[PDB]
Design a binder for this molecule. Structure first.
Ligand SMILES: *[C@@H]1O[C@H](CO)[C@@H](O)[C@H](O)[C@H]1NC(C)=O
Ligand SMILES: *[C@@H]1O[C@H](CO)[C@@H](O)[C@H](O)[C@H]1NC(C)=O
Ligand SMILES: *[C@@H]1O[C@H](CO)[C@@H](O)[C@H](O)[C@H]1NC(C)=O
Ligand SMILES: *[C@H]1O[C@H](CO)[C@@H](O)[C@H](O)[C@@H]1O
Length: 713
């Protein structure tokens, strides 16, 4: 208790605990019931310690239900920027809104799923199937949010990698894979002093996550987590199991509104009858209060004056200037995939056809589908709990129209997905931009026959067939794709008239502004893929399973698999084009700390794991004729002394903006953990001590420009 930065918080918490009755304690750990409070979850106020009715509110990309809030870009769009400054700023901006509404706990960001299964329906909420990128995104988002004064909640712990049967299936993950891959972003989150972690709906090793003692042995033991664990909604199964496993808060308290509470008086009964220790409830409360005090919510926090259930009305307008970071991520997370002799940026075309319903806002209304449970009109968010009501949505045509008008280009509109009207409009313009999508969401909503998870890696809404129609009647086609995740693009790429493919992602309210910022060339695209785009779906080596998942692929997920199995992707992890080119030189690598690392336990694990032990640099030069930013990447290969591992693992990235002909330095600081592996034999992290690490610096997981090594001492 009080390890790391939490000692003053725990002191305040322990003092408060001493004033509480057992009924006070029970009310702090037991949600009031589904929809009974104004938030997605609440616990009762405890006036004797000045504790409010704690407010838990969705979701990761904006405040759910409440009006006059910002609908920020998705997690995966945010990761696609590879820009820690933007990542931090989105978290700050979200947390500013949450605090201003009196939200105590904002339910994000998302470390689980990482997205090991490309079809899985919630992967867009997260931060990629690369644990290093994911972890940097987690820590910068949390630090932002909590700097604004809200408690963040890293979710969903753990192994909820598909929506299909998520509340009955088991994920059974071997020790090494668990630590190196799926745990890794949660460990970064804990090191960044995340206030809370939510346990998942699925079984892990055959026991429900919220009933599994790993909450105590891994989160609170190995990782020395000082905050509190909250259930996913109605993910608690038993009174005694959950308490004893290490759950701290049961949300929403009952089984989605059934008025039956496994904790409440039932938990007091379990204590009275000897099956749960008083010390366990005391520990739960101490943790919840510690997190409250840790982010400073005990003095001068705003009150909730709105409800989730009355249309989201009653609160102040909290949008502030947050559209700025929303636009910057909508822009800078776009990934340019192809661009044949400078098709883009556009430059005063005489005429332009605009094709696809994705070009315009949903004609029925941008918030007309409950929880964004449709793929109709412009797609800027997936569906489920990780949503918000758009205050407005800039569709591509909204942004393009004035820009085209100023250049006197004529627009030929075909804003449905009709293939005949599409070919018709394509024939009538010099250049055609066609807009296609792919969507998915949380597994309580079915859209186009898909209950959360996607049933293929094909474009939705007959998108491939739309593009084929446009290509059949035009010599100059630009494809814009708004998708929640990887798609197989081989049919589109086989079309000789497709001159540029813009992977624009799913980017919130400012989507169409960010897109135009790139299409008309005000800014060079600088995004890089945060997942692999394969040539066929079977190449990922993962898929949605019908029963339990034993994770046989182990460590080898996304590019790690393509690399280990020698499968050429179509577009690799970390790939992205620019309107310029970059050249890399001058690699340096230096061990700055060859010592033994501290074994004193702190949140995140042994403190020495996070010491900076080495630094790598390189020089990057803009070799082209326009300005652009490049995302330099560092991949590490472990020595032969280590067990068999992916050939390359991302361990650094740095984004540099350069004017034409200019040069700068990129820097990658390596933690001891970044140079380690999990040794199941000794049940700990090992840092190799003979041989040499291989260092690969370049523009992608496969566009490696520099190579070096770090002697392992
Ligand atoms: C899950 O089961 C695997 C294989 O049995 C086991 O070795 C691993 O340690 C388990 N992890 C737990 C309980 O956290
Ligand atoms: C203890 O109380 C809990 C909560 O009501 C109940 O489920 C359990 O059956 C009780 N056990 C015994 C041995 O009384
Ligand atoms: C949003 O805020 C504006 C600006 O204060 C206000 O006039 C408008 O009524 C608010 N809308 C809702 C639904 O509260
Ligand atoms: C429309 O726009 C494209 C892309 O800029 C051009 O390459 C084409 O010639 C047409 O003008």
């Amino acid at each position: 208790p009080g390890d790391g930065d939490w000692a003053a918080a725990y002191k305040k918490a322990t003092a408060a605990l001493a004033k509480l009755s057992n009924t006070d304690k029970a009310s702090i750990v037991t949600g009031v019931g589904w929809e009974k409070g104004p938030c997605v979850g609440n616990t009762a106020a405890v006036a004797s310690i000045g504790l409010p009715e704690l407010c838990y509110q969705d979701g990761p990309l904006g405040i759910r239900f409440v009006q006059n809030v910002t609908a920020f870009p998705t997690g995966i769009q945010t990761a696609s920027t590879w820009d820690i400054s933007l990542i931090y700023s989105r978290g700050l901006a979200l947390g500013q809104e949450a605090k201003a509404l009196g939200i105590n706990v904002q339910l994000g960001p998302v470390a689980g799923p990482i997205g090991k299964i490309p079809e899985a329906g919630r992967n867009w909420e997260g931060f990629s199937p690369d644990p290093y990128l994911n972890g940097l995104a987690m820590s910068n988002t949390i630090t932002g949010m909590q700097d604004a004064g809200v408690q963040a909640c890293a979710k969903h712990f753990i192994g909820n990698e598909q929506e299909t049967n998520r509340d009955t299936m088991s994920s059974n993950i071997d020790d090494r894979t668990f630590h190196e891959l799926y745990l890794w972003p949660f460990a970064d989150a804990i090191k960044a002093n995340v206030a809370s972690i939510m346990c998942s709906y699925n079984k892990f090793n055959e026991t429900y996550a919220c009933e599994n003692n790993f909450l105590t042995t891994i989160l609170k033991g190995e990782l020395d987590f000082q905050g509190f664990v909250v259930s996913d909604w109605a993910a608690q199964h038993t009174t005694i199991g959950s308490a004893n496993a290490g759950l701290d808060v049961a949300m929403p308290g009952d089984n989605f509104g059934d008025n039956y509470y496994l904790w409440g008086s039932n938990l007091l009964a379990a204590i009275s009858n000897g099956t749960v220790a008083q010390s366990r409830l005391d520990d739960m409360v101490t943790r919840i209060l510690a997190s409250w005090y840790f982010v400073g919510q005990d003095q001068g926090y705003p009150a909730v004056t709105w409800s989730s259930w009355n249309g989201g009305l009653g609160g102040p307008n909290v949008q502030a200037d947050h559209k700025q970071v929303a636009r910057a991520i909508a822009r800078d997370g776009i990934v340019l995939l192809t661009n044949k002799n400078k098709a883009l940026p556009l430059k005063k075309p005489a005429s332009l056809a605009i094709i696809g319903q994705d070009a315009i806002d949903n004609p029925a209304g941008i918030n007309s589908c409950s929880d964004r449970g449709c793929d109709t009109g412009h797609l800027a968010m997936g569906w489920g709990s990780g949503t918000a009501d758009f205050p407005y949505l800039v569709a591509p045509l909204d942004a393009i129209t004035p820009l085209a008008q100023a250049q006197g280009t004529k627009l030929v509109l075909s804003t449905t997905d009709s293939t005949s009207a599409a070919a018709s409009a394509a024939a009538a313009a010099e250049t055609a931009i066609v807009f296609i999508t792919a969507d998915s969401g949380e597994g309580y909503i079915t859209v186009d026959g898909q209950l959360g998870d996607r049933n293929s890696l094909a474009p939705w809404n007959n998108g491939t067939a739309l593009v084929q129609a446009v290509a059949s009647a035009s010599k100059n086609v630009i494809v814009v794709i708004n998708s929640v995740g990887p798609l197989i693009l081989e049919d589109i790429l086989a079309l000789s008239s497709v001159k540029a493919i813009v992977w624009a992602g799913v980017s919130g309210q400012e989507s169409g502004n960010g897109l135009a910022d790139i299409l008309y060339g005000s800014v060079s695209p600088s995004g890089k893929l945060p997942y692999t785009i394969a040539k066929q779906a079977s190449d990922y080596g993962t898929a949605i399973v019908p029963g339990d998942d034993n994770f046989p692929e182990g460590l080898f997920v996304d590019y790690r698999h393509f690399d280990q199995a020698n499968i050429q992707p179509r577009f690799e992890f970390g790939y992205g084009l620019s309107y310029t080119t970059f050249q890399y030189s001058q690699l340096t690598a230096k061990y700055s700390d060859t010592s033994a690392g501290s074994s004193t336990l702190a949140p995140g694990g042994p403190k020495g794991l996070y010491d900076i032990v080495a630094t790598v640099t390189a020089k990057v030069t803009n070799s082209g004729t326009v300005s652009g930013a490049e995302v330099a990447q560092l991949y590490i290969g472990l020595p032969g002394s280590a067990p068999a591992s992916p050939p390359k693992q991302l361990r650094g990235f740095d984004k540099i903006s350069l004017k034409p002909g200019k040069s700068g330095t990129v820097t990658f600081n390596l933690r001891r953990k970044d140079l380690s592996y999990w040794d199941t034999a000794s049940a700990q992290w090992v840092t190799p001590t003979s041989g040499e690490f291989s260092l690969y610096v370049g523009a992608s997981s496969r566009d490696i420009r520099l190579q070096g090594s770090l002697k392992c001492s």
